[PDB]
Amino acid sequence: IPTVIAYDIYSRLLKDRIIMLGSAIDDNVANSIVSQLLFLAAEDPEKEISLYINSPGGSITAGMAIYDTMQFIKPKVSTICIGMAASMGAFLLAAGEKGKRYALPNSEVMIHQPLGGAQGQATEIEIAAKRILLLRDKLNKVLAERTGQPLEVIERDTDRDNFKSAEEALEYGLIDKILT
Amino acid sequence: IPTVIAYDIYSRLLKDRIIMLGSAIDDNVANSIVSQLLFLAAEDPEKEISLYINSPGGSITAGMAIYDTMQFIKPKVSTICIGMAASMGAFLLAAGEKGKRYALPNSEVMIHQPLGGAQGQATEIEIAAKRILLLRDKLNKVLAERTGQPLEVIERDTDRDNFKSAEEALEYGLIDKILT
Amino acid sequence: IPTVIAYDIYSRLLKDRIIMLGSAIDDNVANSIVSQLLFLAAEDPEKEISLYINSPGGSITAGMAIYDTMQFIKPKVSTICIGMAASMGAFLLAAGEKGKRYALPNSEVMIHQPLGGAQGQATEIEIAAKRILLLRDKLNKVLAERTGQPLEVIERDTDRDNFKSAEEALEYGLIDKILT
Amino acid sequence: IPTVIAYDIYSRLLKDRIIMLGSAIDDNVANSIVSQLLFLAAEDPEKEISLYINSPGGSITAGMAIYDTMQFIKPKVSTICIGMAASMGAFLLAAGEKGKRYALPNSEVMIHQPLGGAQGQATEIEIAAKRILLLRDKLNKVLAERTGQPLEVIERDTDRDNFKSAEEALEYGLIDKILT
Amino acid sequence: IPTVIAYDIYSRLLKDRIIMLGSAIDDNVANSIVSQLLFLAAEDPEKEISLYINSPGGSITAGMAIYDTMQFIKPKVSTICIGMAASMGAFLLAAGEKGKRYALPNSEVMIHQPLGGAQGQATEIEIAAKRILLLRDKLNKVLAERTGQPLEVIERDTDRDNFKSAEEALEYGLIDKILT
Amino acid sequence: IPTVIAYDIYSRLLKDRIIMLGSAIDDNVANSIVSQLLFLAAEDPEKEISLYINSPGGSITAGMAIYDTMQFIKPKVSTICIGMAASMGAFLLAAGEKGKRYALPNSEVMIHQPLGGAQGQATEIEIAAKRILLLRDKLNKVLAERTGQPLEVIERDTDRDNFKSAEEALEYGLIDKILT
Amino acid sequence: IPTVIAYDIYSRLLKDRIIMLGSAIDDNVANSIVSQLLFLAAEDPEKEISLYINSPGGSITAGMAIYDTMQFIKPKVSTICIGMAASMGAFLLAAGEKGKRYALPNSEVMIHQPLGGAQGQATEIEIAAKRILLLRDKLNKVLAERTGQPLEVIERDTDRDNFKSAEEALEYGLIDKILT
Amino acid sequence: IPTVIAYDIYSRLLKDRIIMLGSAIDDNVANSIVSQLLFLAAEDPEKEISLYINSPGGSITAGMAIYDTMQFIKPKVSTICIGMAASMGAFLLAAGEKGKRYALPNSEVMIHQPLGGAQGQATEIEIAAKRILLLRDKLNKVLAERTGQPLEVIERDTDRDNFKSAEEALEYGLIDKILT
Amino acid sequence: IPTVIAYDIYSRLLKDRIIMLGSAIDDNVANSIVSQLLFLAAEDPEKEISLYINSPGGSITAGMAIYDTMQFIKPKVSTICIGMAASMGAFLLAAGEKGKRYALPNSEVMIHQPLGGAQGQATEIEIAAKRILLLRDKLNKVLAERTGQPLEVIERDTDRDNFKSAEEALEYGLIDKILT
Amino acid sequence: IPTVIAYDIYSRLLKDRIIMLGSAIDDNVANSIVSQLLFLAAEDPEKEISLYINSPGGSITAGMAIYDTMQFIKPKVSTICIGMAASMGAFLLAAGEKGKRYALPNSEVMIHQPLGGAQGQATEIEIAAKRILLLRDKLNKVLAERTGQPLEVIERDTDRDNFKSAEEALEYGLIDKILT
Amino acid sequence: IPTVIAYDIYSRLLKDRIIMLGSAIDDNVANSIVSQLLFLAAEDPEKEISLYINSPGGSITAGMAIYDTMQFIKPKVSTICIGMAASMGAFLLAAGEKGKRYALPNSEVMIHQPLGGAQGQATEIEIAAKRILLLRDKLNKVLAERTGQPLEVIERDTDRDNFKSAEEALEYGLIDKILT
């Protein structure tokens, strides 16, 4: 990482309100993007923040921490997709400021149903297999009012891996423009 | 394994119709015990077979091959418990010839819930968690017909462990007589 | 393995034309069962052979070597299921002579679509993803003429995992009688 | 392990009713000694059997099978200590017939309290910690009846590690003679 | 971590009296949050501190060092749950003041009974199993007065894993209002 | 890595608008070249940028991010091949403007098919072997209009491996001028 | 591997002149099959021998030993493909006497070009890369003589992988009949 | 090991009353030598036995078993030393019958003080340190009454490794003759 | 290894004076081949012996044992080749009796320099490098009077690797016929 | 690595025009010497640059980047060999400006043949063994014009290894002055 | 490493012209001591430098760079042995200016032969063993013309390890004055 005069390269374009996201969302990335959003919203709360996404997925609980923090602060967040947004980048790309969700002309978007696991007695499997079915049908209701489709279309599109492109994610409703 | 004149020590007892079970029940111990029960029932189908149990459990599907073969054949099987019969020896000890189910004066019996696991893709955790719940309620419906208790008592006792002795398994109904 | 007088235990059984199968099917089990079927056929070719199944699955080319070698010999093969026949034991269980496919009162049968993998260039995946698609429709057409169902029921019926019972495989068509 | 003319060296002594125990006790050694004690007592059950002990301990629940079986059968067992009988050989050495319990002139005998472990929730270190306290309050009642001491002495000096010799085990009450 | 001008983002928020907690609690995290609470208390003793929680948690002795320090200093702490608050994170919620315990709208919450282990002699298991039962009945006696429930109703549902949400943890008593 | 005075020599060249690429592309180099292109475009958006390529390959989705950001920004990028450009440096070398693609006289260039893999059921192989063909048939539709060849020449030149440069990459059309 | 009274199950078929092949061809499977062919030919040299093939491949030099030996001896060999013959079973299957070479109706046949490797100086790759080019222009000069095709078709089909079937290798010329 | 006509090479030497010892003494070698000394003295108890020693020591409680059994049976044991008898072979070499001990002319002998270890808290090292000092002082007295030296000479000769010879461990007692 | 009536397949061939060599020559293969050569030469010292070679490489000193014993004994040895004879196999192939060296028409023969290594001081490298240069100026002095070429040709073409043929080794002088 | 006052010891020398090379040339060293040559050239492009070489390097594609950049830039480059220059360090030592290539009196230059490897099908070794023979014959043509020898002398000098000695490397033509 | 006011402790003793060598001379150590000698020489070339040696010695070629650079530069180097100098520590200790080689009174010096290895064919062993015999007679000549002894004394003193002292290396000629 270079040095810009003394900043570095990711902290120089935070002075212009740009947040970069380029790795899998574990519990340390979600602790840093939350802090950057809280710092930017509490020093000039009428401007606009950008967010560039290149994530190949991540965790469910550490991806629902950036989402409601994006909804909670006062500025408006516009999300741009370079590369590929897959399975939790496709949930943050379609979750900021209807009117301002962009994509570059050859990108990709993938949506599917959650993963998990359970082990133990015959009761500690029934406890843990009843949570993931309550967790699936609460993301299926957020995506239906974010994109605009019915619920019974997203209940059967997101059953296996469903890859799209930059031109047929615009017909679905995930993005709004294609940047040139 | 001493030689007895040629034999060994385990195949000399099989000439007097004694089967010996002394390890955990994986998928190729059940094969050998099923073969020995078939051979002994085929050569003289009106005598009596014994079966000594000292076993710390095993798998469920390879422990329903025994308890099927020893109800299917024509002779009568008498089960004796030395050492400890735990969680799948307690299911075969209480499953042969009501009238002949013995135990030695400081043995030990244990009964509890099934175990299992599941992994990945929340549509196929429901498949694997709906099976073990159907497998539990067919084991504690056989134990109620074998011992004599109501079903609401065995649904409550078989939880987290239940260690008994030679004098409490006689009051519960698992054995019939303490040998001296 | 006892040594019944010299023999061992499941070679005294082969003198009464009984073949046991109790492990997963690689290409060493298939060699032994093919050799035993050939030896029993070219000794007295008018007497019935039995076959007991307790297998959890296995390979797909070494399981279709036991299948078409018992339509080729002259005697009749009768298949019995102890324990569990899953995903390649369910394909050999519904391949005995019609009238002679049995099951014990608490057993299990499971059927699903085949597995596989591919690795390499963009042409060596297209080569190996057409073989596994031809090998599935080659294998859904044998089961439809063996059980008696239409093809579009077994095409959508397997598709994930399908656990069954002894009383629930009579209605489907895999079993002709439940033994008591 | 030489050949004696066909026989063995351990299978030749068994023709003169001598059982030899020379390793740690698990549920694979207890199975063999239970089988040998069952075989020798159906083959003129009046003649006495010897048992030579050189064992450095083992399992608690698999050293009770031998102890039950050598009071269940009809002949009389005589135990001789060679080398060292420690912590479960000292429990079988003091369980031969009163009158015949021997030791060689420089041997050792060690007694102490059981071992174990527990792991899990806060209510599964309560099930498995009031079992191991119920299990050592029943070995002291057997040792107090076998040797002759009061209970509050044996529960007082078997607390850390108690090493003895051939001349202090005779005053304590574990053996009856010293062979020369 | 960026370099907001010279310090990073976690140290830029600390001069606005904001503490973040985003990992499991060993005794290195508990040694740092205690130091930050002491430094913020002995700089301006009458001014509120915030504390954001996203944590799977778990160490009982190093999780009751932050609790006692939260009640020891003079200013008032206000805890906000953001993504997930498991075992010893839901116990650090319901310790902000009385009217200042918030939660975001998604925000899962979990409570259950302690874990542990023990190994050794039969006397060193009783010592370590008599302690964890004294620890459990002092944790769910603090939880009954920070919440408002009776003791018999929170020693009954914290027996296995008990997941809540942001709308039915408010009916229980762990939350005062949810944020929009 | 020296300390030209404070700087170092990747950040002393960056203020002369020179970007260096010297390793494989692995979704973390592609996040650090996008930021440098954005910073240099927002600094002064008319002067041209250079880019030196020495890479042996990389991934496909993190190679279509640099290729997109090269076209999106307002300045003009000029690409120079320095030692070796293989399979994703040969795709980035033919993306400088149209008359500003250079190579030194001892260089190599390689072009071939994509690579990948697939594992699972017979349906999750057909899903994943159908996007790699759609991904192969859109890279040689960009290369065929970047170099100038017809499509059915690029479809058969890139079948195995194609080592050529410095006097055959100029005739093919990938570069414009050899530097001396 | 059972016992037939003293014999084996593979050594009982050998006195009816049947050789089985069920493994990959390494350097000491070829030794056993060469020894069996020599022993059967030097005992009664006017009598047919069979050979059952189910093998995934092997090495080039230890697969030409069997091919030379089964044509040096005086009897006539008749090869039968039972489950799968891939890349060195397809070369041994089309080497029995013309009129023989049967196959069962659920079989497969695969043919492709040989594999290898080289490592070292620049003049020790040139030695080992013009030997593997003389091997594959002498294998498909034998295959084009056994099956009866032009050489420019055999050197064009065997380029990636072929994967024929039982009714598709009969038109090519590899087999002669399809058994019942 | 060869075959002598059916016998072995050690069973023939046991047939004319020769016992061989050529490895380190654990409690499997002691069991076999105790069994051979028991068998050889019960079939003809007036003929002497030989014993050849080539061992580099071993355990200290499994080396007293052979000593006691040598003193206990009725025949007379004569010990010969080939190679090296070190630190427990030197204790069994000086335990044959006084008058019949031998050594070949290159037959190094070694004697030293015992080994051991201890681990635990401060009152479990005191037990294991009193035991080994009780164990050393009872081997010194046996060596003093076998060889014929004072006790305070062997208390200071056996402090480090001693390494005598064939003509040098005859002045010291301990061999009684040198063979051819 | 099938049983032939008792024998196996390799010891039935030795009754007709056939020795089979099919693995690399370590120091256990040379012992066995020297032993059965000595055994066959003493039953009847006129009848000739065969030897089939399929071996890649070996050791230099353990391959001179077989070469010496082949000329020490009185009958005449005839060497046949199938497959290989890579490094030390081709040195034993050209060591049978000079009218009786055969080869099958799909065979290969290699010849090259010996190999070795050295490590230590500057004197223990000179000692070990002065010996491997006396080995290879005595191997190709035996090969020159065995094949018939001059010495300065065999010093010249056995420098890197020389794979030939069945038809190209006949012109050189290594074999005498080609069997059909 | 000390601190000359801020600098370190390698960047204080780059205040003058001195570049050090002291490790094997991988793809990271060649990326950091190219940057230093570019920076020193585009700062005062008319003086001189020194370069000290002590390296047993090789990464042939990543060792011609430095060779091309040494002639692309303007000023001049004078190379000094300090401790040893093996292959691709001798190729860089003999590429300084003619008249200014120095060596200290103990230096030991070495030159030889390239290395490589190849794995795969029979037509992917022919691609990779045809590249390395084209890569060797273009380095021979560069040494033949840098040093001054004919081509057929360097074609057989660089065949195994030849270590020169900084005084017979001056007669060859690699250097042209020995420094004192 | 402490800090001296900024510096550290090793760069504060370089303003006073001291070089500290305290580890094994691999590469990356010769490359640093060469740089420090060049920097100290090219800023004031009339003041002498010190060099403290405490090292077990390392590579031969990376210990000749320091030796050549010590005589190339203009100032005078004065070497002081402090704890031990052994085998390219002694070779640099006896290379300072004559009259200025000191040693502390508890030091020791060691001299012996070089070491190496060789692994390839029978020609690549002769190439690598003709070099280490020639690298030894050029070190013996330097030690002979440096200490003052004849050559045939150092050719047999340095044949095995030859330890010395401070009062014993002064008679030999390695040092000039014990410092005290």
Any idea what the CATH number is for the domain that residue H33 is in?
3.90.226.10
Beta-carbon contacts of residue I175 (< 8 Å; ≥ 6 apart):
I81, I93, I94, I101, I102, I103, I166, I169
K117 to I118: CB separation less than 8 angstroms, yes or no: yes
CA distance E161 to chain A (A): 7
Nearest to D158 by CA among D144, D177, D170: D144
Nearest to E45 by CA among E25, E64, E72: E72
Beta-carbon contacts of residue K37 (< 8 Å; ≥ 6 apart):
K19, K49, K66, K69, K70, K73, K77
A121, A124, A136: best to mutate for the B interface, most B CBs within 10 A: A121
- Beta-strand ranges (E) seen in B76-124 are 76-86, 102-103, 109-110, 115-119
* Amino acid occupying residue J90: A
Chain K residues contacting J via beta carbons under 8 Å:
6-8, 10-11, 14, 27-28, 30-32, 34-36, 38-39, 42, 61-62, 64-65, 67-69, 72, 123-124, 127-128, 131, 138
Whether J78 is a known active-site residue: answer no
Residue G125: which of J120, J121, J129 has the nearest Cβ? J129
Residue I113: which of K113, K116, K123 has the nearest Cβ? K123
Q: What are phi and psi of F137, to 5 degrees?
A: -85, 15
**Collapsing DSSP states into helix, strand and coil, what is residue H25?**
strand
Identify whether F1 is part of a domain.
no
Question: Which residues in chain A are contacts of E6 at CB distance < 8 A?
Answer: 6
Token output for A6: 């003394």
Give the Cα separation of K41 and C39 in Å (integer): 93
Token output for A73: 């602060």
Residue A55, sorted as left (phi over 0), alpha (psi -120 to 50) or beta, turns out to be beta
Beta strand pairing call for K115-118 and I118-121? antiparallel
* Chain J residue nearest residue G160, CA to CA: J121
Beta-carbon contacts of residue K19 (< 8 Å; ≥ 6 apart):
K33, K36, K37, K40, K49, K50, K51, K52
H35 to D16: CB separation less than 8 angstroms, yes or no: no
Give the Cα separation of C113 and C136 in Å (integer): 7
Give the Cα separation of K132 and F163 in Å (integer): 41
Contact call for C and K: 3+ CB–CB distances under 8 Å? no
C22 to B39: CB separation less than 8 angstroms, yes or no: no
Q: What is the DSSP letter of F21?
A: E
Question: Which residues in chain C are contacts of F118 at CB distance < 8 A?
Answer: 117-119, 125, 129
Identify whether C65 is part of a domain.
yes
CA distance G113 to chain C (A): 14
H68 to D104: CB separation less than 8 angstroms, yes or no: yes
Identify whether B4 is part of a domain.
no
Token output for H135: 């164990």
Q: How far is CA E70 from CA A74, E35, E110, G148, K102, in A?
A: 30, 11, 21, 90, 65
D43, D64, D145: best to mutate for the B interface, most B CBs within 10 A: D64
Q: Between F and J, how many residue pairs show a Cβ–Cβ distance under 8 A?
A: 73
Give the Cα separation of A10 and I55 in Å (integer): 64
Q: What are phi and psi of B102, to 5 degrees?
A: -105, 175
Token output for A141: 């209701």
Token output for J16: 């003058």
Give the Cα separation of B65 and B54 in Å (integer): 18
**Collapsing DSSP states into helix, strand and coil, what is residue J4?**
coil
Give the Cα separation of H115 and H104 in Å (integer): 29
**Collapsing DSSP states into helix, strand and coil, what is residue F38?**
helix
Identify whether E1 is part of a domain.
no
Angle ∠(K150,K153,K156) on CA atoms, nearest 5: 150
Chain G residues contacting C via beta carbons under 8 Å:
1-6, 9-10, 12-13, 16, 18, 20, 22-23, 52, 54, 82-84, 104-106, 108, 160-161, 163, 179-180
Burial of I30 (0-12, 13-18, 19+ CB in 10 A): buried
Residue F58, sorted as left (phi over 0), alpha (psi -120 to 50) or beta, turns out to be left
Q: How far is CA I101 from CA A39, C161, I45, I98, I104, in A?
A: 89, 64, 20, 7, 11
Identify whether A179 is part of a domain.
no
Whether C11 is a known active-site residue: answer no
G54 to C38: CB separation less than 8 angstroms, yes or no: no
* Chain G residue nearest residue J119, CA to CA: G117
Angle ∠(E113,E119,E124) on CA atoms, nearest 5: 95
Question: Which residues in chain B are contacts of D127 at CB distance < 8 A?
Answer: 160-161, 163
CA distance I111 to chain K (A): 13
Nearest to F60 by CA among F163, F155, F132: F132
In what helix (H) or strand (E) does residue E19 lie, and over which residues does it extend? strand E18-21
Alpha helices (H) along B16-164: 30-43, 69-72, 90-93, 126-136, 143-147, 151-157
Provide the β-strand partners of residue B178.
B103
Question: Which residues in chain F are contacts of J8 at CB distance < 8 A?
Answer: 2-3
Domain range for G83: 9-178
Beta-carbon contacts of residue F145 (< 8 Å; ≥ 6 apart):
none
I54 to G65: CB separation less than 8 angstroms, yes or no: yes
CA distance I116 to chain K (A): 6
Task: State the chains in contact with I (3 or more Cβ–Cβ pairs under 8 Å).
Answer: G, K
* Chain G residue nearest residue I13, CA to CA: G39
Identify whether H99 is part of a domain.
yes
Identify whether G4 is part of a domain.
no
Looking up tokens 């809280």 gives: A38
Alpha carbon A19 to its chain's center: 13
**Collapsing DSSP states into helix, strand and coil, what is residue D11?**
helix
Q: How crowded is the C-beta side of K2, counted as CA atoms within 13 Å? A: 5
In what helix (H) or strand (E) does residue C130 lie, and over which residues does it extend? helix C124-137
J114 to G122: CB separation less than 8 angstroms, yes or no: yes
Overall size of chain A counted in residues: 180
Give the Cα separation of E141 and E126 in Å (integer): 23
Nearest to A140 by CA among A129, A149, A127, A130: A149
Residue G13: which of C38, C68, C131 has the nearest Cβ? C38
Give the Cα separation of J83 and K103 in Å (integer): 28
Identify whether A177 is part of a domain.
no
CA distance D70 to chain B (A): 11
Provide the β-strand partners of residue A32.
none
User: What is the CB neighbour count within 10 angstroms for residue J177?
Assistant: 11
Task: State the chains in contact with H (3 or more Cβ–Cβ pairs under 8 Å).
Answer: D
Domain count, chain J: 1
Burial of H83 (0-12, 13-18, 19+ CB in 10 A): middle
Q: Do F99 and F113 touch, CB atoms closer than 8 A?
A: no
Question: Which residues in chain D are contacts of E119 at CB distance < 8 A?
Answer: 116-118
Nearest to A35 by CA among E35, E20, E17: E20
CA distance J136 to chain G (A): 8
Q: Between B and C, how many residue pairs show a Cβ–Cβ distance under 8 A?
A: 69
Nearest to G177 by CA among G110, G120, G93: G93
Nearest to J63 by CA among J14, J102, J24: J24
CA distance J8 to chain G (A): 41
J23, J53, J84: best to mutate for the K interface, most K CBs within 10 A: J84
G179 to C123: CB separation less than 8 angstroms, yes or no: no
Query: Which residues does a gap of C–N over 2.5 Å follow in chain G?
Result: 5
Alpha helices (H) along chain D: 10-13, 29-40, 64-72, 89-93, 132-135, 140-147, 151-157, 168-172
